[PDB]
Amino acid sequence: HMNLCYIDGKFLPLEEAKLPVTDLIIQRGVGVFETISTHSRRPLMLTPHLKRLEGSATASSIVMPATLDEMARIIREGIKKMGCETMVRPYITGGDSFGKDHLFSSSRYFVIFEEIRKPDPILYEKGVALHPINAERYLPSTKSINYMLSFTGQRDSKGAYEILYCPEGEIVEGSHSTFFLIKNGHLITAPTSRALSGTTRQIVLELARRGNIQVEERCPLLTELPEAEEAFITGTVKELLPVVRIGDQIIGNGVPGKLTKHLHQVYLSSIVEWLE
Amino acid sequence: MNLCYIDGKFLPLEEAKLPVTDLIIQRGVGVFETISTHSRRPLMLTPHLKRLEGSATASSIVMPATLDEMARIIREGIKKMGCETMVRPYITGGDSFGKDHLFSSSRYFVIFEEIRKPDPILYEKGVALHPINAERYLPSTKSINYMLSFTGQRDSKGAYEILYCPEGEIVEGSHSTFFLIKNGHLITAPTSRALSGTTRQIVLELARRGNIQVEERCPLLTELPEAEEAFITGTVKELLPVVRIGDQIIGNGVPGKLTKHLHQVYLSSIVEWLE
Ligand SMILES: Cc1ncc(COP(=O)(O)O)c(C/N=C(\CCC(=O)O)C(=O)O)c1O
Ligand SMILES: Cc1ncc(COP(=O)(O)O)c(C/N=C(\CCC(=O)O)C(=O)O)c1O
Numbered sequence: 001h002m003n004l005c006y007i008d009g010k011f012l013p014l015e016e017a018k019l020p021v022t023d024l025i026i027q028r029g030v031g032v033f034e035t036i037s038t039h040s041r042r043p044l045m046l047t048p049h050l051k052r053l054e055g056s057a058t059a060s061s062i063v064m065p066a067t068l069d070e071m072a073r074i075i076r077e078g079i080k081k082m083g084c085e086t087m088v089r090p091y092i093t094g095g096d097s098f099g100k101d102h103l104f105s106s107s108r109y110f111v112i113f114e115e116i117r118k119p120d121p122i123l124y125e126k127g128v129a130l131h132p133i134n135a136e137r138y139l140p141s142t143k144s145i146n147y148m149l150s151f152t153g154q155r156d157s158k159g160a161y162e163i164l165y166c167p168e169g170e171i172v173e174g175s176h177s178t179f180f181l182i183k184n185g186h187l188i189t190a191p192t193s194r195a196l197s198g199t200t201r202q203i204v205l206e207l208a209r210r211g212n213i214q215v216e217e218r219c220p221l222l223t224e225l226p227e228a229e230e231a232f233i234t235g236t237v238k239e240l241l242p243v244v245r246i247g248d249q250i251i252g253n254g255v256p257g258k259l260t261k262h263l264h265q266v267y268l269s270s271i272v273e274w275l276e
Numbered sequence: 277m278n279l280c281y282i283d284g285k286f287l288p289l290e291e292a293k294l295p296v297t298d299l300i301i302q303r304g305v306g307v308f309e310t311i312s313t314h315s316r317r318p319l320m321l322t323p324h325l326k327r328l329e330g331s332a333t334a335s336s337i338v339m340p341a342t343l344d345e346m347a348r349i350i351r352e353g354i355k356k357m358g359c360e361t362m363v364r365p366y367i368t369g370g371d372s373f374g375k376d377h378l379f380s381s382s383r384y385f386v387i388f389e390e391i392r393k394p395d396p397i398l399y400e401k402g403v404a405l406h407p408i409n410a411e412r413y414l415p416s417t418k419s420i421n422y423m424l425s426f427t428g429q430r431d432s433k434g435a436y437e438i439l440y441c442p443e444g445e446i447v448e449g450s451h452s453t454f455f456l457i458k459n460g461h462l463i464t465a466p467t468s469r470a471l472s473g474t475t476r477q478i479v480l481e482l483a484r485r486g487n488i489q490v491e492e493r494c495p496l497l498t499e500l501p502e503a504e505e506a507f508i509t510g511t512v513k514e515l516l517p518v519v520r521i522g523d524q525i526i527g528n529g530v531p532g533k534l535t536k537h538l539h540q541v542y543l544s545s546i547v548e549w550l551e
Pocket of ligand 2 (some may be wrong): 309312418443448449450451452453471472473474475476509510511512513515
């Protein structure tokens with residue numbers, strides 16, 4: 001199906017939807033969003049995503065322009081119209097003004113609906129490279145629209161798949177992904193005091209609980225990578241994507257590892273539990 | 277009325293729209309400049325447009341128009357406004373990042389608004405800043421990312437502006453160059469750390485003319501109790517006195533004599549840089 005945008009009460013073809021230049025998302029980068037994906041055309045972790053969207057807006061002093069029930073109504077209606085596997089992005093804008101009450105009270109919203117684009121199967125076979133940077137995401141619980149560092153930082157990337165935020169040599173997360181390290185057959189991942197509360201992350205920790213795999217919620221260190229067996233990044237579109245290189249450092253023997261492939265299989269076998 | 281130049285026309289500002297496909301909207305990929313007028317002439321027009329090109333190039337965005345063309349639009353829009361104007365040319369990422377790692381379908385538009393100077397009372401009383409432990413990444417680049425300038429005013433205590441103070445080193449304001457005055461000297465962060473402000477560049481020339489010493493280092497939050505004065509600079513706000521940073525009063529909590537002197541010399545001198 002054609003890509004859609006829900007804006008001003010209607011589903012438009014995506015390429016026709018426009019936003020007023022007065023909006024502070026355009027002028028000043030004031031915006032939050034979510035990415036929601038489907039399996040068998042059903043939305044995965046819809047409620048957790050919409051609660052995260054509200055968290056992002058409230059933490060950003062943005063007054064929600066619609067109820068979560070209303071956003072869920074729109075998202076379901078658009079997925080039905082797409083009739084295929086879909087990546088859905090609801091956006092909440094700052095709107096035209098920051099009031100004397102220090103809130104954005106005229107927020108706009110729109111929802112993008114696109115045919116899903118999974119990473120190429122070769123990337124799951126070979127794994128990917130990450131480019132570490134000495135930077136952090138501010139207000140890391142908040143998912144804002146600001147991804148400019150993910151792009152401008154590709155000059156020095158050496159064709160890395162994704163940037164990895166490594167402030168002072170402590171690995172937190174990717175620009176689009178949760179990061180997991182594997183040492184001694186268990187999982188190391190940054191705490192959500194420092195990293196986004198990923199929906200895929202939440203599911204992987206539940207799968208680890210079910211499988212009696214130990215999870216340490218601490219920032220893995222760049223200096224620990226020589227001793228690691230495996231690594232992977234997570235997100236709703238990419239699922240579990242093996243990581244075989246970070247900077248100049250090969251992870252383990254430089255191919256996807258057995259615990260990564262195991263968790264990926266259990267994820268896909270289990271996924272129906274979290275569809276809405 | 278306020279205007280936006282977009283797709284070859286001056287529109288009423290409130291009617292101009294941008295495709296939601298644009299990565300400025302989806303991913304915050306955008307750069308811009310703020311240019312202000314005195315006597316209907318843009319101040320430091322060429323320095324601003326050189327900064328805009330620098331921002332775009334540093335961000336892998338291919339210029340969608342020449343600087344001469346942007347200068348032409350800006351002058352025509354100032355003439356159409358018929359008042360003192362704040363002008364903001366924007367350059368967007370456009371719809372795609374190519375295999376060549378460039379934004380090659382950049383869009384652009386130019387906002388013209390009647391200027392809004394800080395109220396005269398703010399120059400008389402000075403303003404408060406809210407310090408935060410954060411930095412602007414790629415600080416020479418002026419991107420559209422000002423989200424922290426707002427969201428970081430949660431516990432602001434009614435501060436005028438946030439001040440980037442990473443690890444207690446003062447760099448700059450969210451919209452401003454920061455200057456500390458100590459022993460009759462100016463202290464301001466080097467351009468390795470802070471935006472190369474146009475107002476900043478003029479104030480350093482005014483310091484040279486007045487034999488006022490400038491130290492290009494980050495003032496520390498711990499130095500503030502020994503400071504005499506502070507001010508912030510930008511093309512709209514000129515020199516705006518700072519009398520409080522966080523809980524710390526600056527000097528005796530009113531605008532200082534060197535700030536008021538430099539502001540007077542600035543107003544007398546800026547004709548030199550009107551274009
Ligand atoms: C900063 C950050 N960390 C982690 C994640 C992963 O969270 P979740 O597992 O809930 O998707 C995302 C989502 N990144 C996406 C899309 C998801 C994907 O990467 O597949 C984004 O919306 O940009 C993210 O933007
Ligand atoms: C991060 C930052 N630093 C410094 C400056 C001061 O530069 P200049 O002296 O060239 O104006 C600005 C301008 N910020 C503005 C306008 C503020 C003003 O005009 O007073 C802005 O649009 O955000 C800025 O955004």
